Amino acid sequence: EVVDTYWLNQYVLNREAYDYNTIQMNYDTTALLSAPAVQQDYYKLFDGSNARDRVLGNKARITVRVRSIQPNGRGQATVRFTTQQHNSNGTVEAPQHQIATIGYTYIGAPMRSSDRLLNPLGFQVTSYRADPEILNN
Amino acid sequence: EVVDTYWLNQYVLNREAYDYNTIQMNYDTTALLSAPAVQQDYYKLFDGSNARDRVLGNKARITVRVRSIQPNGRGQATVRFTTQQHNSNGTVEAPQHQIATIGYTYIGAPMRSSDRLLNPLGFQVTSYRADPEILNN
Amino acid sequence: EVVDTYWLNQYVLNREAYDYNTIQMNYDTTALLSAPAVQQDYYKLFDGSNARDRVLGNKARITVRVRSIQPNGRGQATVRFTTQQHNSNGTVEAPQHQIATIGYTYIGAPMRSSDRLLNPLGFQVTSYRADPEILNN
């Protein structure tokens, strides 16, 4: 649980977050921690006219933080986290709450210096979804 | 070597780097990966009139990247990395080259959710120094 | 000049510096970058009742940084550097200024993994001295 929750946290934070200035590392890291199917789903978020690269670009940024992760089975865990948007005019949008479900495995140590210094454990997401949390409190 | 080089990289990058917007996490992470002696040396960099918080503040930022890490013994490794300063006027200072020497151990898994989700392995720096690299090429 | 100044810097810094925690690497590195005559002069600094290992031990440490290196001939260069002593009570002694004169050559690549990963070029000091700088400014 300790090791898996770390990877699940780092995966969600980097995947969901955005900053023009650091995204290249978060982008490559997310891919490094994703199965090709998952990598493609992720890559597509930066494509077309509605691309994160065009919508947020260098005008707005996304901050992500994980509150709690609890494994529930055989390659599966639930991640409870929040997200918020900041921008160039100094304003901040109200924070949203989201929950990710992550299917995962490990593929063992990678054999490239550019990969082992980022994901030595071989963490890999095989399935991913994240829905809005409804705060029925 | 794979696991230790990761921790040594993340330690140096977060320790040496600075961004008003993300430093609270890098600051706490550095402390989490540092022996109290080391933590104090680090904390002091944010103190007084020459504090990183006042010198860089929200006017300038530091970008750090590690090129190569090679362990050399019994709790000791050499980290070769670069650093550069960016600012609010859109300018960039010439990059500098530096080499860190890190003495380290591991203290095992921590027993707080706020620590295990950042340093589950227990990485801890017990000694740290970083000098300018002289590019006698 | 670029390559030689690097080796001259790394040699002086590691030779003159001291930290109980990292000295084994600096010690072996210095020897790796020294002619047997030079290695012996160096080894002797850790011998007897006035040994660096007993004087500094784990109570005090030496920090060394090189300001400038300028080659002057046929296997010879001048290294301008500073040094300071720190200790366990949290105090720091006033920094001193020193100048080293280094006679040197290269012996080509070494044939042991423990040597090539530290001195692949074969840098070797054949003569060494360092005197106090008199700041007649």
Residue numbers in the entry:
A (entry chain F), B (entry chain E), C (entry chain D): 95 to 231
Can you list sentences taken from the study reporting this PDB entry?
In Gram-negative bacteria, conjugation is mediated by a large transport apparatus—the conjugative type IV secretion system (T4SS)—produced by the donor cell and embedded in both its outer and inner membranes. The T4SS also elaborates a long extracellular filament—the conjugative pilus—that is essential for DNA transfer. Here we present a single-particle cryo-EM structure of a T4SS complex from the R388 plasmid that comprises all four sub-complexes: OMCC, stalk, arches and IMC. Three ATPases, VirB4 (also known as TrwK), VirB11 (also known as TrwD) and VirD4, power the system.
The arches (the composition and architecture of which were previously unknown) are composed of hexamers of homotrimeric units of VirB8peri, forming a 177 Å diameter ring around the stalk. The arches, comprising the VirB8 periplasmic domains (VirB8peri), also form a hexameric assembly with variable occupancy. Six VirB8peri homotrimeric units come together using the β1–β4 sheet on both sides.
